[PDB]
Every structure is written in structure tokens, then in C-alpha cells.
Amino acid sequence: STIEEQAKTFLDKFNHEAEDLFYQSSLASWNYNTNITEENVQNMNNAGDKWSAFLKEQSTLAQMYPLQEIQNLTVKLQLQALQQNGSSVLSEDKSKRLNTILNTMSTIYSTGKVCNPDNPQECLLLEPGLNEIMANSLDYNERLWAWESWRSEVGKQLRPLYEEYVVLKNEMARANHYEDYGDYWRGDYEVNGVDGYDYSRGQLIEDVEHTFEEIKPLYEHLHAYVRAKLMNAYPSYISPIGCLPAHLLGDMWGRFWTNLYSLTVPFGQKPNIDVTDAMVDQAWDAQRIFKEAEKFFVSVGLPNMTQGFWENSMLTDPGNVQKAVCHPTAWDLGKGDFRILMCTKVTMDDFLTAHHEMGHIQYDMAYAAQPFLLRNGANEGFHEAVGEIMSLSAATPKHLKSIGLLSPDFQEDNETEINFLLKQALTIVGTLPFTYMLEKWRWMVFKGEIPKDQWMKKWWEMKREIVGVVEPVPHDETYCDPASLFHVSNDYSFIRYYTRTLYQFQFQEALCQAAKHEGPLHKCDISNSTEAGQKLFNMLRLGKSEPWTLALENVVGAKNMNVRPLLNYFEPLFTWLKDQNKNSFVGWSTDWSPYA
Amino acid sequence: TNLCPFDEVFNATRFASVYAWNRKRISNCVADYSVLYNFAPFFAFKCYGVSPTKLNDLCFTNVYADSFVIRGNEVSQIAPGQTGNIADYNYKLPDDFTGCVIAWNSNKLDSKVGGNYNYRYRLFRKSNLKPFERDISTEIYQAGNKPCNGVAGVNCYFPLQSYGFRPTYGVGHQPYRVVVLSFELLHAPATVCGP
Ligand SMILES: *[C@@H]1O[C@H](CO)[C@@H](O[C@@H]2O[C@H](CO)[C@@H](O[C@@H]3O[C@H](CO)[C@@H](O)[C@H](O)[C@@H]3O)[C@H](O)[C@H]2NC(C)=O)[C@H](O)[C@H]1NC(C)=O
Numbered sequence: 001s002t003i004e005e006q007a008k009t010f011l012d013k014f015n016h017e018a019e020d021l022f023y024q025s026s027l028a029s030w031n032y033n034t035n036i037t038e039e040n041v042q043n044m045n046n047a048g049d050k051w052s053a054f055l056k057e058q059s060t061l062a063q064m065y066p067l068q069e070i071q072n073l074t075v076k077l078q079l080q081a082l083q084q085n086g087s088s089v090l091s092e093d094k095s096k097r098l099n100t101i102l103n104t105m106s107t108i109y110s111t112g113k114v115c116n117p118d119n120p121q122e123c124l125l126l127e128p129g130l131n132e133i134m135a136n137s138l139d140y141n142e143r144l145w146a147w148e149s150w151r152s153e154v155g156k157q158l159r160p161l162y163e164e165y166v167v168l169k170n171e172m173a174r175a176n177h178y179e180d181y182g183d184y185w186r187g188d189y190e191v192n193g194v195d196g197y198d199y200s201r202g203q204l205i206e207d208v209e210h211t212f213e214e215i216k217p218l219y220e221h222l223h224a225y226v227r228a229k230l231m232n233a234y235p236s237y238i239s240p241i242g243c244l245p246a247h248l249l250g251d252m253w254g255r256f257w258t259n260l261y262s263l264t265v266p267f268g269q270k271p272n273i274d275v276t277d278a279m280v281d282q283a284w285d286a287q288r289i290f291k292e293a294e295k296f297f298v299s300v301g302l303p304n305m306t307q308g309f310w311e312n313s314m315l316t317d318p319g320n321v322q323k324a325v326c327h328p329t330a331w332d333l334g335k336g337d338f339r340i341l342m343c344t345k346v347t348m349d350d351f352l353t354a355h356h357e358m359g360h361i362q363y364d365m366a367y368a369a370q371p372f373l374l375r376n377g378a379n380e381g382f383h384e385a386v387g388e389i390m391s392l393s394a395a396t397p398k399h400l401k402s403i404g405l406l407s408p409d410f411q412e413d414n415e416t417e418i419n420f421l422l423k424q425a426l427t428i429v430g431t432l433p434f435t436y437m438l439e440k441w442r443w444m445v446f447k448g449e450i451p452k453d454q455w456m457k458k459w460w461e462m463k464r465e466i467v468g469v470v471e472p473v474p475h476d477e478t479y480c481d482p483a484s485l486f487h488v489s490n491d492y493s494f495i496r497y498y499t500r501t502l503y504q505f506q507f508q509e510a511l512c513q514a515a516k517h518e519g520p521l522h523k524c525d526i527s528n529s530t531e532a533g534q535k536l537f538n539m540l541r542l543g544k545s546e547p548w549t550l551a552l553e554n555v556v557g558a559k560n561m562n563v564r565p566l567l568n569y570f571e572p573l574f575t576w577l578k579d580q581n582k583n584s585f586v587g588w589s590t591d592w593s594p595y596a
Numbered sequence: 597t598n599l600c601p602f603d604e605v606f607n608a609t610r611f612a613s614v615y616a617w618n619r620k621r622i623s624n625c626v627a628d629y630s631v632l633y634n635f636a637p638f639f640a641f642k643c644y645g646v647s648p649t650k651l652n653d654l655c656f657t658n659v660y661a662d663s664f665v666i667r668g669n670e671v672s673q674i675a676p677g678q679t680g681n682i683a684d685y686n687y688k689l690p691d692d693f694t695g696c697v698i699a700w701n702s703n704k705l706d707s708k709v710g711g712n713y714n715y716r717y718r719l720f721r722k723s724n725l726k727p728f729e730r731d732i733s734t735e736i737y738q739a740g741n742k743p744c745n746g747v748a749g750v751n752c753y754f755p756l757q758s759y760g761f762r763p764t765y766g767v768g769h770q771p772y773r774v775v776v777l778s779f780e781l782l783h784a785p786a787t788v789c790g791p
Pocket residue numbers: 008072073074075679
């Protein structure tokens with residue numbers, strides 16, 4: 001018999017064993033996240049350890065099939081998934097130290113407190129105290145205290161742990177035939193074997209930079225506009241030509257400028273499209289919200305939710321007696337079990353997030369017939385992009401009117417539209433330079449291009465150069481400000497958000513062209529478009545069976561990431577900004593600082 | 597009147613695994629086929645080569661009731677000319693099948709909260725089963741070129757797999773009881789009739 005047939009039989013046995021083990025682990029973690037008790041945490045950890053041990057056994061088994069001798073692309077993909085080898089290639093002590101430092105960083109992030117605002121008994125953690133400050137405070141000194149306290153307290157502890165983390169992760173990635181840990185992370189996008197759809201791990205850097213280059217002008221004009229508005233808010237604190245102080249951006253890091261909308265709204269006289277009061281006055285409940293989302297998905301040719309979904313799910317707050325984790329999550333347990341975990345309130349934000357999570361669930365149902373290790377998005381950005389196009393379609397006033405939550409005589413002037421595009425941009429375009437610079441800094445650190453004695457130096461140099469953001473106080477190498485963010489200190493890649501932001505507008509453009517939509521892209525509602533539904537399902541059903549380039553081409557007609565969908569979405573706001581900045585400086589000097 | 601013991605086959609406490617499907621020989625009794633629904637609504641009721649009702653009047657020398665349990669997705673494989681894991685390696689019906697297939701849901705019966713791994717199915721086999729063939733061999737399948745020597749290991753897998761039915765599973769992965777009825781025509785006088 002051939003190696004390919006042996007691998008196929010191995011994968012059948014593996015699929016049925018892992019389906020069942022993963023289902024047990026998923027059930028345990030669900031019982032934890034919906035019912036936090038000690039018995040539940042012990043069951044969750046037991047099932048998870050069983051699953052990890054099974055995975056390592058199956059990895060050592062799958063390493064016996066010489067990949068090069070496999071001529072079937074699908075079996076090649078599944079075999080590669082088992083052939084991770086990840087960290088196992090480390091000695092026992094080095095692996096132990098890596099796990100120790102990972103858990104330690106996670107602990108110090110999720111537990112760090114800063115004390116003595118006035119009295120050492122008053123102490124605040126990141127959530128909700130410090131986040132409340134960074135979101136609502138208009139006091140320069142208060143915002144600066146919160147920002148600098150968070151960093152000089154938790155990041156100083158995180159610094160040496162992060163250096164050892166870098167060195168150990170690079171050891172792992174190099175032992176696994178990679179250049180560095182950044183190369184390992186970029187491997188998620190790698191395609192190797194399909195002629196005309198291949199993709200190297202460095203091609204990601206090239207494409208990301210070429211597209212950020214094309215993003216630069218819109219972001220520059222948004223930056224200039226926000227800078228002027230903040231000068232009105234912080235007059236003696238902000239230079240009209242300098243970078244924005246990092247502690248005035250709306251959150252702890254500047255990842256989103258969303259909380260600057262109150263300070264940057266173009267036309268604060270117009271009413272905001274918050275349909276929460278309409279939902280409350282029509283006596284909507286979580287049942288109605290999720291039923292409406294289901295009706296939306298069925299209107300484009302996708303199936304209803306399963307009876308197993310409707311019976312086995314927590315769609316409302318279980319109350320005071322039973323405490324649960326309320327982060328909205330879409331659970332694909334396998335064996336046809338689909339659930340949503342959400343403590344839904346009757347608000348427009350929860351309506352949109354329900355649309356997002358049910359988009360996740362529809363994705364999971366659509367690639368269910370794929371083999372186990374292939375039941376996943378094409379790459380790390382695809383799932384969130386799908387959820388986000390759902391929420392975009394649901395937020396349009398056209399959809400809100402058709403469902404009956406917005407008055408039929410609500411007129412969409414060009415100023416409510418400019419408001420909407422600015423509020424969208426503060427979040428969507430405000431985050432792209434932040435994301436790209438953080439991931440670039442990590443890539444360069446892993447690659448060994450930024451020495452340790454100027455880590456923070458290059459960090460803030462890049463802050464200045466790329467993001468247009470400047471630190472309010474100088475930081476030496478004792479600090480570790482990048483690790484003061486969750487994704488950095490918890491070993492999660494970050495470029496997924498950039499790639500998903502570009503993908504989501506590619507998908508929206510494609511499906512709205514398919515839906516014969518008329519006008520500006522941001523007014524598009526793909527409801528009742530079986531053509532758009534089919535075009536999206538043709539990609540959803542693929543899972544990770546086809547290369548992500550092929551999956552993206554299936555929907556948008558292009559083999560690579562594209563920035564023009566995003567730019568077309570934001571074109572009206574772009575022209576409005578270009579006019580609004582005629583007598584304002586666009587761009588920024590990298591040399592001005594708030595501390596001489 | 598001596599009727600046929602369909603209560604033993606259909607309301608059995610425990611159904612057999614599909615790899616070891618259980619056959620009951622029915623003869624010398626009156627068969628009552630005009631019962632449309634005996635447990636729940638008609639779930640799966642497909643008579644090939646014969647009508648469901650208004651046809652209990654036919655007489656056969658023997659009736660064969662073959663019972664087992666599969667997951668819902670596989671209920672489509674209990675038909676003439678089907679292919680798949682069950683149809684190839686577990687239970688095969690001939691192309692000219694002149695009988696009936698009656699399947700129904702048993703999620704309340706065969707779904708243990710901690711998983712019901714008592715139902716097994718054959719995943720690996722060196723040849724597809726002949727129609728109405730039964731195979732029960734707990735012998736290690738040799739996928740590789742080395743001999744397994746009756747031990748499971750590298751390229752040497754145990755041929756049976758547990759369904760592990762759970763009450764929360766989807767309808768496609770829930771326990772389904774199946775009963776196949778075959779009707780035999782022999783030179784001997786008929787022994788099963790319904791007047
Ligand atoms: C690479 O290997 C895979 C096996 O892992 C091949 O997929 C298999 O392809 C056969 C032939 O199409 C499938 O059999 C089919 O079953 C359906 C039942 O829905 C039936 O209607 C068809 O007539 C046919 O008999 C088989 O199911 C499928 N395996 C899986 C797991 O889906 C694949 O074809 C190989 N690639 C190449 C290029 O040969």
C-alpha cells in the first residue's frame with residue numbers, strides 16, 4: 001500500500017476519535033463558561049488536558065507519513081495540521097519555563113492593580129477603573145496618570161519575562177524550521193502546493209506594507225481632523241503639527257479612537273442612529289433579537305438555526321443565582337451541536353453583536369461536512385470578517401427600516417452620513433496603523449533587528465513614524481509598554497485584525513455588487529439577496545480545504561488582499577476630510593514631544 | 597389467534613450495534629402490518645418492491661426482522677444501492693431488495709449524558725459486505741505493509757469505533773433505531789399471513 005492511503009486511513013481513525021474527544025472538551029468548557037463553579041473548572045481542565053495529550057499523541061503518529069510523498073492536497077493539509085510539533089521540540093525544562101512565563105504574564109496582566117491615587121488603599125485594575133478613566137476623562141493630568149501608572153507598574157514587571165519569552169519562542173520556531181517567531185506566526189497565511197494560489201510567509205509583509213501605503217492618506221486626513229478637534233479639547237497641550245499624545249486617544253493604548261467621537265463629531269446637532277429606545281418600546285427580548293438575526297440570514301438563502309441551537313444555549317443573563325462569563329462567543333462543539341453564549345440586553349449594540357456571532361455560527365454550520373482539522377476559516381482573519389460584514393449589513397438604516405425599528409420618514413442627509421462614516425473610521429481606520437506598527441515591532445524583535453537596549457526606543461520611534469502618536473512621558477528600557485496590551489502579553493498574533501479589516505470590506509463590496517446595490521457602499525443592505533448569499537456560501541462551505549487566496553477569489557474575484565474596498569467604503573468621508581483640512585496641516589512631525 | 601412477536605423486535609429494551617445487527621426469524625404467526633405508528637410519528641418508512649398498507653394480505657414462508665442502531669446521517673445508507681461506512685462494512689441490502697425499512701429516533705433511549713459508547717460500528721474492512729452479510733471480527737486491521745500480529749499500533753488500528761451518543765448531539769449524530777423487514781418465498785407453504 002501507498003503512504004497516501006495509509007495517511008487517509010489514519011485520518012479517518014483520527015477524525016472520529018478527535019471529534020468525540022473535542023466534543024467532551026467543548027462540553028466541559030461550556031459548562032464552565034455558563035456556570036462558573038469549582039467542579040466545573042476541574043472538569044474543564046481535565047477534559048482539556050485529555051485533549052492536549054491526545055493531540056500530542058496524534059502529532060507523533062502523523063509525523064510518520066512523509067509529507068513529500070502525499071499527492072492529495074486535502075490529506076496534505078490535515079497531515080500538516082497534525083505535524084505542528086510546536087514547542088514539543090524544546091527540552092522539558094525550556095518548555096516548562098516557557099509555560100511558566102506565559103502564565104505569569106497572563107496573570108500579571110489580568111491581575112495588575114495600581115494604587116495610591118491619593119491613598120494607598122484605593123486601588124484600581126485595568127477593567128473597569130483604568131478603562132473608565134481612559135474612556136471618559138477629559139482631564140489631561142488624570143489621563144496621563146492612568147496611562148503612565150498602568151505602564152510603569154505592570155509593564156516593568158512584564159519586561160524581563162517578555163525578553164525570556166522572545167528568546168524561548170524563537171528557539172521553538174527555529175527548531176521547527178522557521179526563521180523566527182514572527183515567521184511562525186506569518187506561517188498561518190502560507191500556501192504551498194497550489195499553482196497560481198501560492199503564498200510565502202514574507203509575501204504577507206510585502207502585501208501588508210503596500211496596502212498600508214495606500215491607506216496612508218485617508219488616515220493622515222483623519223489624524224489631522226482629530227488633532228484639530230483635540231486641540232479644541234486640549235488647547236495648551238497639543239501641537240498643531242506634532243503626533244497625538246498617546247493618553248488622549250480614547251482607550252489605554254490608542255487601538256481604537258472610538259471614544260473620541262464625542263470630541264470629534266462633525267455635526268453633533270444631528271441625532272445618532274441608536275434604535276435602542278425603539279427596541280425597548282416594541283417590547284423586544286433576546287428571543288426576538290436572535291429570531292430577527294435568523295430571519296436576516298434566511299432571507300439570503302441560508303438555513304435557520306438548529307433546534308439543538310435553540311434549546312442548548314444561554315441567550316439571556318441567567319441571573320444572580322448562576323454567574324457566567326458574558327463575553328459573546330459562538331460555540332461549535334461538533335457532532336451538530338451549535339450554541340451561542342451571550343448575556344443579551346435589549347440594546348442596538350447587542351443586536352449587532354448577535355448578528356456578528358450568528359454569522360460566526362453560520363460559518364461553522366456551512367463547513368461542517370469538512371474533515372475535522374479542516375473545519376476552520378481559510379486563515380485567522382476570515383471568521384471575524386464574516387461576523388463583521390453581518391453586523392455592517394444589520395447596522396444600515398435601510399435594514400433598520402425594513403425590520404421596523406427605525407421610522408420610515410427618517411431622512412438620510414449627507415450630515416448623518418458623514419457622522420456615521422466618521423464614527424466608523426475612528427474605530428476601523430484608526431486601528432490600522434496601530435495594528436500594523438505593533439505587529440511590525442514584534443516581527444522585528446523576533447527577527448533580532450531591534451536590540452534590547454533600545455526596544456522601547458524603536459517602539460516609540462515607530463509609534464511616532466507610523467501611527468502619528470507620541471508618548472506623553474519618556475520611557476527607558478525598564479518599561480515594556482507593548483506588553484501592556486492583552487494580545488502582546490498573552491501570546492496572541494495581532495495582524496489578524498488588519499487582514500480581517502481589509503477582507504471584510506472586500507466581502508462587503510463583492511456581495512453588494514452581487515446584490516445589485518445602488519449608491520455608496522456604506523448604505524448597502526444585502527438582505528433578500530440570494531445571489532450574495534450563494535456567493536458567500538461558496539466560500540463558507542470550503543472551510544480550510546482550499547487556500548485562503550482561492551477562498552477570497554471565490555467571493556471577490558481576487559487572489560490577494562485589497563485596500564480599494566475599504567477606500568470606496570470611506571470615499572465620501574475622505575472627500576469631506578480633504579475639504580475640512582484645507583487650512584489645516586495634514587501629516588505630522590516625528591520630533592515634537594509634550595516633554596521637551 | 598397466534599400473532600407475530602413484533603413487540604420483541606420493536607420495543608426491545610436494548611438494540612444491537614450495527615456491526616453485529618440482530619436478526620429475528622418470524623414464522624408461524626399472523627403479522628399485523630396495518631399498525632402505521634407504534635412508538636412515535638412515522639419517522640422513516642420506506643418499503644421497496646412492496647406497498648406499506650393495503651398489502652398485509654400477502655403471505656411469505658418467513659419474515660426476517662434485522663434490528664440495529666446508527667446515527668441519523670447514516671439512515672440514508674439503509675437502502676438498495678447505497679454506499680458509505682454502514683452500507684459497505686456494516687449492513688448491505690441487495691439492489692433488488694423486496695422488503696421494508698423502518699427507522700425512528702431514540703435520543704431519549706440511547707443517549708447517555710456522559711456518552712453512550714456501548715454502540716459500536718465497523719470503520720475498517722478489507723472488502724465491502726455482501727448483501728445481508730454479517731461480520732464480527734475484533735481483529736486488528738492492517739493498513740500498513742508490516743504485520744500487525746494481533747496488536748494495535750503504527751498503521752494497525754482496531755476496526756471498531758464507538759458512537760458515543762450524547763443527548764445534546766445534533767439530529768444527524770443522534771441514536772436511531774432501525775428495523776429491516778425481509779420477506780422470503782420458498783417452496784414450502786407460507787407461514788406468515790395477515791387476513
Ligand atoms: C483526496 O482524498 C479524498 C479522500 O480523503 C478524496 O475524497 C473522496 O472522494 C470520493 C470520490 O468522489 C468520495 O466518494 C463519493 O461519495 C459520495 C457520497 O456523498 C458519492 O455520491 C460519490 O459518488 C463518491 O462515491 C469520498 O466521499 C471522498 N471522501 C471524503 C472524505 O469526502 C478525494 O477525491 C481525493 N482527491 C483527488 C484529487 O482524488
